[PDB]
Amino acid sequence: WRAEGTSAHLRDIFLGRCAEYRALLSPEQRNKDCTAIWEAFKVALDKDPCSVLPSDYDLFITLSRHSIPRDKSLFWENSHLLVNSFADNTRRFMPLSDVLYGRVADFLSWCRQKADSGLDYQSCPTSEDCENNPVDSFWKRASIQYSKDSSGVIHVMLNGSEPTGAYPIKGFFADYEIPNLQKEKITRIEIWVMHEIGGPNVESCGEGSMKVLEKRLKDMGFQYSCINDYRPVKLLQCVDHSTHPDCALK
Amino acid sequence: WRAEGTSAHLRDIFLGRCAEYRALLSPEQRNKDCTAIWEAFKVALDKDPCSVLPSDYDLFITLSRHSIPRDKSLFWENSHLLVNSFADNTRRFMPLSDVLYGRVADFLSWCRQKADSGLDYQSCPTSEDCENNPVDSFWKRASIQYSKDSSGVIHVMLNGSEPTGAYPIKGFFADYEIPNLQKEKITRIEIWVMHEIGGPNVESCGEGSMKVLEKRLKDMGFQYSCINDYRPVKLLQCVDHSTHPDCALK
Ligand SMILES: Nc1ncnc2c1ncn2[C@@H]1O[C@H](COP(=O)(O)OP(=O)(O)OP(O)(O)=S)[C@@H](O)[C@H]1O
Ligand SMILES: Nc1ncnc2c1ncn2[C@@H]1O[C@H](COP(=O)(O)OP(=O)(O)OP(O)(O)=S)[C@@H](O)[C@H]1O
Ligand SMILES: *[C@@H]1O[C@H](CO)[C@@H](O[C@@H]2O[C@H](CO)[C@@H](O)[C@H](O)[C@H]2NC(C)=O)[C@H](O)[C@H]1NC(C)=O
Ligand SMILES: *[C@@H]1O[C@H](CO)[C@@H](O[C@@H]2O[C@H](CO)[C@@H](O)[C@H](O)[C@H]2NC(C)=O)[C@H](O)[C@H]1NC(C)=O
Numbered sequence A, B: 001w002r003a004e005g006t007s008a009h010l011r012d013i014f015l016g017r018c019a020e021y022r023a024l025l026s027p028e029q030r031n032k033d034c035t036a037i038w039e040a041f042k043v044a045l046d047k048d049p050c051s052v053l054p055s056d057y058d059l060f061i062t063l064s065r066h067s068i069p070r071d072k073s074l075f076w077e078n079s080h081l082l083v084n085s086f087a088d089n090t091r092r093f094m095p096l097s098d099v100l101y102g103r104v105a106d107f108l109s110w111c112r113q114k115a116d117s118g119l120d121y122q123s124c125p126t127s128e129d130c131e132n133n134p135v136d137s138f139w140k141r142a143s144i145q146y147s148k149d150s151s152g153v154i155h156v157m158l159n160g161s162e163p164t165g166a167y168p169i170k171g172f173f174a175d176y177e178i179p180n181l182q183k184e185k186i187t188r189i190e191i192w193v194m195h196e197i198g199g200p201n202v203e204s205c206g207e208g209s210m211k212v213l214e215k216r217l218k219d220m221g222f223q224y225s226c227i228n229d230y231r232p233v234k235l236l237q238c239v240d241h242s243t244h245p246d247c248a249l250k
Helices: A010-025 A034-046 A054-064 A078-087 A134-148 A172-177 A209-219 A230-238 B010-023 B034-045 B055-064 B080-087 B136-146 B172-180 B211-222 B230-239
Strands: A074-076 A153-157 A186-194 A224-228 B074-076 B153-157 B186-194 B224-226
Touching: A010 A034, A010 A209, A010 B010, A010 B211, A034 A054, A054 A134, A054 A186, A074 A078, A074 A172, A078 A153, A078 A230, A172 B074, A186 A209, A209 A224, A224 B186, A230 B230, B034 B055, B034 B136, B055 B136, B074 B080, B080 B153, B080 B230, B136 B172, B172 B211, B186 B211, B186 B230, B211 B224
Parallel strands: A074 A153, A153 A186, A186 A224, B074 B153, B153 B186, B186 B224
Antiparallel strands: none
C-alpha cells in the first residue's frame, strides 16, 4: 500500500476526541454515545481494505450527526492546517474537522490488513491502489453530510500558492460538496484565495482554475464573491512572519 | 465546594490527549505508557479531596516527564487561551499545557467525593474551601517540574489589561515557578506584556507590579528584558479585530 498505515492507538485517540468534542455541543444535542459511534466507525476496519463504500459509514454518521450553525461552514482545499488554526476549535468557524464526525478522524489513517483481521500499521491503500478504501470512503461520506447540512453564507478557503491552481476539478470540494449544497438554504458563496507570505502567487481571484470554479457556481445559480488574502486569515499567517513587509503594521 | 465538579469522561479525555501527544514526542522519549500514567494520576485522585499534596503526583510526573527544548519555554499569567493559541501545539513555543503532563489536565477538573469512592461531578474544593485539593496541588507539582526543566531564553506572557496589574505577586509564576528556575542553565528572561486590542493599558513594562517583577528577577541575578505587545502575539490578537486601527497593515 502506497499510503500511511493506520494511526497508532486509533481507538483511544478517537474516543478522546469524541469525549472532548461533546463539551462543545449544546446540551439538547449533547447526548452522544462515543463508544457506539466508535463501534459503528469500526465496521470499515473489519472489511477488505479495498472494499469499503461511503455508505458503510451511514450508521456512524447517524450516531454522530449534529447541526451546523448558519453562516459557520468553512470548506477548503489545500489549506488544512490554516483552516483548523483559523477555525480555532469552532470559535470562529466550523469546518468539517470541527464537526463531531470530522473531528474524531481528522489527520488519522486506518485500514484492515489485506488477508487478516488485524489492522495494517505498515501502510494503507491510496486512491490509486484501489478506489474504495476506508479513508477515502470515510471522507466522501462525511463531506456529503457536511455539505447537505450547511446553510447561509458558505465560506471556502483555497490556496493561491498551490502549483496546480487554487481549485482542483477532481477534489472533494468539486466532486462531493459543491453537488451536495442545498441551494435553497444558501444565501451566497464567498471564496478566500490565500497566498503564502512572500510566497508565490500562482493564482488569484478570477485567474485559471478560479475561473472554472466561479463559472460552475454562477452557472448553478449561486450568488458568488471572491477575496484575495482575506484579512483575518492573512493576519494569522503573519503570526509566523512578523518582520516580513507584508505583515508590517501601521 | 465552590469549584467546578470533575470533568465528565475524565479518563477518556486524559487517555486520548496522552495518546495524541505521544506523536509530538521525540522517538527517544516516545516510550510513554498512558494507562500507567493515568493510574499514577489516579493515586492522588482517590485520596480525600482536601488531603492531596503536590508530592502525591510525584509518580505521575516521574512517568510522564520529558525534556523541554532549550529556549522554548513559555510561562504566563492571565492569558491561558492566548498562550495556548500562540504556542500552537508545541510548534512555536512549548508552554506547560504543551508538555505531556500539562496537556492531559489542561482545563479539566477533578476530585473525589468528600466521603465516597466516586469522583464528585457536582463540585470540587477551591483554594478557599481548602488548600490541599487535587487540582491546585496538581498545577503546583507540574509548575515546579516545568520550571526545573526549563533552560535557555525564558519567556513570559503577562496581561497588562489585568485590572489588578500584570504581575500577580501571589500567583503560580511568582510562588512556584520563579523560585524553581535554574539560573545556571538559563541565559535570560524576556517578558511580553500584552494589552487587549483597544483594551486598557493598566500596566506596561516598567509600571506597577512590573517594577516588582523586574526587581525580583534582577536581585536573583537574571538578565532581564521586557517588551510591550510582542508583535507575533499582537498579530494573533489582531486576527479577531482585523479592522481595528491597531491592526491595520501597510
Ligand atoms: N474537511 C476535511 N478534513 C480532513 N480531511 C479531509 C477533509 N476533506 C477531505 N479530506 C481528506 O483528507 C485525506 C488525507 O489526505 P492528504 O491530502 O494527504 O492530507 P491533508 O492534510 O488532509 O491534506 P489536504 O486536504 O490536501 S490540505 C484525503 O483523502 C482528503 O481528501
Ligand atoms: N500552565 C497551566 N496550564 C493550565 N492550568 C494552569 C497552569 N498554571 C496554573 N493553572 C491553574 O488553572 C486552574 C484553572 O483556573 P482559572 O484561572 O479559572 O482558569 P484558566 O483558564 O487557567 O484562567 P487564567 O489562568 O486566570 S488566564 C487554576 O487552578 C490555575 O492556577
Ligand atoms: C499552500 O500551498 C503551498 C504550495 O504547495 C504550501 O507550501 C508548500 O508546502 C510544502 C509542505 O509544507 C513544502 O514542501 C513547500 O516547499 C511549500 N511551498 C511553498 C512555496 O511554501 C502551503 O503550505 C499551502 N498552505 C497551506 C495553508 O496549506
Ligand atoms: C486580559 O485581561 C482582561 C481583563 O481582565 C480580560 O478581558 C476580560 O475578559 C472577560 C471574559 O472574557 C470579559 O467579561 C471582560 O469584559 C474583559 N475585560 C476587558 C477589559 O476586556 C482578557 O480576557 C485577558 N486576556 C487574555 C488573553 O486572557
